[PDB]
Design a protein around this ligand. Structure first.
Ligand code: 1OC
Length: 273
């Protein structure tokens, strides 16, 4: 460990959140991403089964990294004097959803349907594993361009899923629900559905629906691109002001706009290749 086990490549991206390098596992040489995070920058911590002090991100990643390909899996991790190092899967070739939408503009609804469906399946997986992502957005989704498969990343703002109120939030504000803006309170699943509404709008419109707090609070959705009545309805449902008025995940996936989704590979062949 650890420079011995991997050859570090170019820096891929950086924030106060962390620094992520492209890497190869020597002995594979499996493509990986190497994420470094300073201990001083870590807000919430968790406990490992073996009884260890560890960043919450690691706890959450472990609970979700069991082979379902909808989430980027944690392959290994290391503690260093002033930081933790995470070894993550790296698809190749890859592009995040933010850059993809930026290049292509608003997505055709057939493509948005396929992508949105996969994100839903990924989020359902997380919730099933007792994990709430809390920062669902285009920048946090990778596209395996060859397979047409979407992968969730960055559990740095996440939490253990619970049925009681959350009173903290460190995800992206423009994706945060009106109940957070107004009361500093939200529940996990209904807040997630709100962010999914924002994500879906962004996909079919090429930009997010709200920029300011008062716009989020007002909750009026204006469409800047041509979008079918069905898709508009689903979006509006997801962005209901009252959390209890939002659809469940079952209701979203049973929505008429969500029917007859393409398989990931079909999606790649038609829209990606
Ligand atoms: O798991 C994470 N990243 C990754 C795991 N596996 C990957 N493979 C390819 C890439 C990748 C992204 C963008 C361009 C080329 C790439 F090979 C990122 C990751 C991750 C978790 N938290 N986090 C926080 C920041 C960050 N930075 C990468 C960003 C670069 C700008 N686009 C959004 C990405 F998240 N990455 C992460």
């Amino acid at each position: 460990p650890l420079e011995s086990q991997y050859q570090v490549g170019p820096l891929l991206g950086s924030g106060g959140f962390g620094s992520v390098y492209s890497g190869i596992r020597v002995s594979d040489n499996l493509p990986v991403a190497i994420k470094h995070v300073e201990k001083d920058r870590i807000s919430d911590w968790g406990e490992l089964p073996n009884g260890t002090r560890v960043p919450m991100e690691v706890v959450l990643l472990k609970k979700v990294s069991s082979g379902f390909s909808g989430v980027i899996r944690l392959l290994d991790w290391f503690e260093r004097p002033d930081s933790f190092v995470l070894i993550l899967e790296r698809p190749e070739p890859v592009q995040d959803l933010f850059d993809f939408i930026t290049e292509r503009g608003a997505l055709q609804e057939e493509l948005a349907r396929s992508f949105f469906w996969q994100v839903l399946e990924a989020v359902r997986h997380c919730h099933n594993c007792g994990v709430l992502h809390r920062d669902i957005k285009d920048e946090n989704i990778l596209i395996d361009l060859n397979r047409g498969e979407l992968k969730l990343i960055d559990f740095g703002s996440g939490a253990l899923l619970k049925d009681t109120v959350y009173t903290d939030f460190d995800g992206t504000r423009v994706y945060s629900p009106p109940e957070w803006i107004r009361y500093h309170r939200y529940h996990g699943r209904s807040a997630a559905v709100w962010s999914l509404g924002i994500l879906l709008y962004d996909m079919v419109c090429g930009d997010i629906p709200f920029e300011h707090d008062e716009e989020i609070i007002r909750g009026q959705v204006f469409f800047r691109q041509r979008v079918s009545s069905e898709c508009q309805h689903l979006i509006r449902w997801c962005l209901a002001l009252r959390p209890s008025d939002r659809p469940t995940f079952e209701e979203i996936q049973n929505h008429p706009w969500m029917q007859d989704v393409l398989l990931p590979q079909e999606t790649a062949e038609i829209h990606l290749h």
